[PDB]
Design a protein around this ligand. Structure first.
Ligand SMILES: [Mg+2]
Ligand code: NA
Ligand code: NA
Lengths: 211, 210
């Protein structure tokens, strides 16, 4: 959840917002180790319920998200249903565990390609066109993350938009991402320079991946 | 002496506007068939399966025409080669279907088949079903027969399934056409077509359009 002013500005200027619980357990092995564990349900529940209690009156918020990259655990299903009960006015989405689980109203993959399948075990990233028409699948597809804009990038951006315009149920996506997370450091003359992972003696680090 | 007056055009032509040569005549077989007065007038064969296709029930509905009699029987027997695999015998008289009763002139036979050999384009396993109309005592009146392929066709979750597996149709539309004989079909040409189709990785044909 963002600084509270953010939603007021989105209300007034007019932007659709996905409000997302502060829950990410990406580094767990497997990714759902905590989110499938009932002992972590109380902690997760508060991150979801208190966001809804804070932000539910903002019209800019159109979709609730259960968090990010935390696999798919029984705790997600429980909190999915909690939101659906207390606030029927907004769909709930969640990408973890393969982007089309029972804890999501929207197929919301990250970095699924337009035409090319990436058939990873357990959590495949289907071509978005193919994904829509998988046997029994009926939900809209909106990429929670796509077109990773790291450095000289956004190659093939037009391919997404052609697909979005052609397929009614491809309803767009959220580019990753808005702003480089570089930090300012200063040389011996006080001249500023943009720093990334590792430039602060931080180790292990993931170098320029913050930008 | 038979006299047949064949018209090229009729009100039927309005329903026969296929993209093909417009021809006319007696272009398929003519035959004489002798049936007994008490006869098999219709029969339907169905095959239903359990979830893993390790068990089947062949269901055969048989209809008769002629005089209804207590001594009449139908036997449906199922054959794989010279081996009889299942048999069922019953007198006529279907189950009650409404307030006025049932079909006295019908009977449904149900034959259990364990581990049926399944029919597909890949392996066209066939059984022979023989439908005997006969007396209780076993005097034959007449027999009809057909080839039986144990297969289930169904659409589930948006997939066309054959025997529980999603088909991939390598199909072709085929008209009945011969460059010399027009729209008259012969066994030799039909067989030539089927061999060529299968040799070229086709598994399906649409009877375009009749
Ligand atoms: Mg036409
Ligand atoms: Na669309
Ligand atoms: Na990053």
């Amino acid at each position: 959840p963002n600084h509270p002013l953010w939603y007021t500005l989105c209300d007034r200027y007019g932007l659709y917002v996905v409000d997302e619980a502060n829950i990410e357990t990406h580094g767990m092995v497997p990714m759902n180790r905590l989110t499938d564990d009932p002992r972590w349900l109380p902690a997760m529940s508060e991150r979801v319920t208190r966001m809804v209690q804070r932000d539910r009156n903002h019209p800019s918020v159109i979709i609730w998200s259960l968090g990010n990259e935390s696999g798919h655990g029984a705790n997600h299903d429980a909190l999915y249903r909690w939101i659906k009960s207390v606030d029927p006015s907004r769909p709930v989405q969640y990408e973890g565990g393969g982007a089309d689980t029972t804890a999501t109203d929207i197929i919301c993959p990250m970095y699924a390609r337009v035409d090319e399948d990436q058939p990873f075990p357990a959590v495949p990233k289907w071509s978005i066109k193919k994904w829509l028409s998988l046997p029994g699948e009926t939900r809209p597809l909106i990429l929670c993350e796509y077109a990773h804009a790291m450095g000289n990038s956004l190659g093939g951006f037009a391919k997404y938009w052609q697909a979005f315009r052609q397929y009614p149920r491809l309803q767009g996506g959220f580019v990753w991402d808005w702003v480089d997370q570089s930090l300012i450091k200063y040389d011996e003359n006080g001249n500023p320079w943009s720093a990334y992972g590792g430039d602060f003696g931080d180790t292990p680090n993931d170098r320029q991946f913050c930008m | 002496r038979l006299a047949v007056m064949v018209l090229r055009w009729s009100d039927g032509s309005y329903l026969e506007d296929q993209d093909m040569w417009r021809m006319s005549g007696i272009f398929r077989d003519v035959s004489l068939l002798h049936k007994p007065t008490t006869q098999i007038s219709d029969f339907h064969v169905a095959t239903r399966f359990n979830d893993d296709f390790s068990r089947a029930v062949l269901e055969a509905e048989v209809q008769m025409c002629g005089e209804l009699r207590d001594y009449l029987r139908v036997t449906v027997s199922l054959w794989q080669g010279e081996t009889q695999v299942a048999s069922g015998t019953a007198p006529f008289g279907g189950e009650i279907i409404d307030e006025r009763g049932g079909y006295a002139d019908r009977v449904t036979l149900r034959l259990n088949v364990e581990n049926p050999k399944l029919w597909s384009a890949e392996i066209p396993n066939l059984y022979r079903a023989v439908v005997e109309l006969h007396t209780a005592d076993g005097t034959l009146i007449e027999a009809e027969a057909c080839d039986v392929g144990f297969r289930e066709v169904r659409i589930e979750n948006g997939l066309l399934l054959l025997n529980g597996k999603p088909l991939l149709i390598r199909g072709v539309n085929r008209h009945e056409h011969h460059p010399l004989h027009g729209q008259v079909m012969d066994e030799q040409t039909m067989v030539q077509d089927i061999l060529l189709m299968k040799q070229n990785n086709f598994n399906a044909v649409r009877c375009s359009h009749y």
